[PDB]
From a paper:
Based on the obtained X-ray crystal structures of CHS, CHI, and chalcone isomerase-like protein (CHIL) from the same monocotyledon, Panicum virgatum, along with the results of the steady-state kinetics, spectroscopic/thermodynamic analyses, intermolecular interactions, and their effect on each catalytic step are proposed. The production of these value-added products also offers the prospect of increasing the value of the crop, especially because many of these compounds are soluble and readily extracted.
The asymmetric unit contained two molecules of PvCHI that did not display any significant interaction between them. The substrate specificity of type I and II CHIs has previously been attributed to the difference between Ser-190 and Ile-191 in type II vs. Thr and Met, respectively, in type I. PvCHI has Ser-190/Ile-191 in the α6 region and displayed significant activity toward isoliquiritigenin.
Author numbering: 4 to 217
The structure:
């Protein structure tokens, strides 16, 4: 696949998550923002990488022969990407500066809000959120810094950090909680995913890769 540039952040076409031993291809990338003052403010650039070989083989079974527009409009496609039996890897690269405490507080607060509403919040998720916040607490992310998320096929979220766009080779903190692992990816590409740009990129690029497998 080709590289994708997002507002000064270059995402290479391949990634190797720290210590996973797998290679990924760039499924898609896009900016992520929040409405501030009635306008869209860009905060991060996000690249979504999927396991080479295994993601295409799994996704082709239900989504082969579908166009970019059809995949982009079908929330069940993105749900299949999130829950898929293959590794995923997300790189969040800062456009505006963020501190670990605020980023992790917001992510987890929103996860716990949902889980408890739908009554699936268990001690396990509370512990996973604590471990997630503990990993982010000492960290600050100037522009260009990155958060790296490995989403293992069984549902382990590994959290690592980088001062720039590069990916470390030594793994980060392993958080063995499938709900948190999927929620982090879901918050990006899900129905209410915070990056519509990333979602459109993934659907266009995966649609064309699915054609070379059929």
């Amino acid at each position: 696949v080709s590289e994708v540039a997002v507002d000064g952040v270059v995402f290479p076409p391949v990634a190797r998550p720290p210590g996973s031993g797998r290679s990924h291809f760039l499924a898609g990338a896009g900016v992520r923002g929040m409405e501030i003052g009635g306008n869209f403010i860009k905060f991060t650039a996000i690249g979504v990488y999927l396991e080479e070989g295994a993601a295409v083989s799994a996704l082709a079974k239900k989504w082969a022969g579908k166009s970019a527009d059809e995949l982009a409009a079908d929330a069940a496609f993105f749900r299949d990407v999130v829950t898929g039996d293959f590794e995923k890897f997300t790189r969040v690269t800062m456009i505006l500066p963020l501190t670990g405490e605020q980023y992790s507080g917001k992510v987890t607060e929103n996860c716990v809000a949902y889980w408890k509403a739908v009554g699936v919040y268990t001690d396990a998720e509370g512990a996973a959120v604590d471990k997630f916040k503990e990993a982010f607490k000492p960290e600050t992310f100037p522009p260009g810094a990155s958060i790296l998320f490995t989403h293992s096929p069984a549902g382990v979220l590994t959290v690592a950090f980088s001062k720039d766009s590069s990916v470390p080779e030594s793994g980060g903190v392993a958080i063995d909680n499938k709900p948190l692992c999927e929620a982090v990816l879901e918050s990006i590409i899900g129905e209410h995913g915070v990056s519509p740009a990333a979602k459109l990129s993934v659907a266009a690029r995966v649609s064309e890769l699915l054609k070379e497998a059929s």
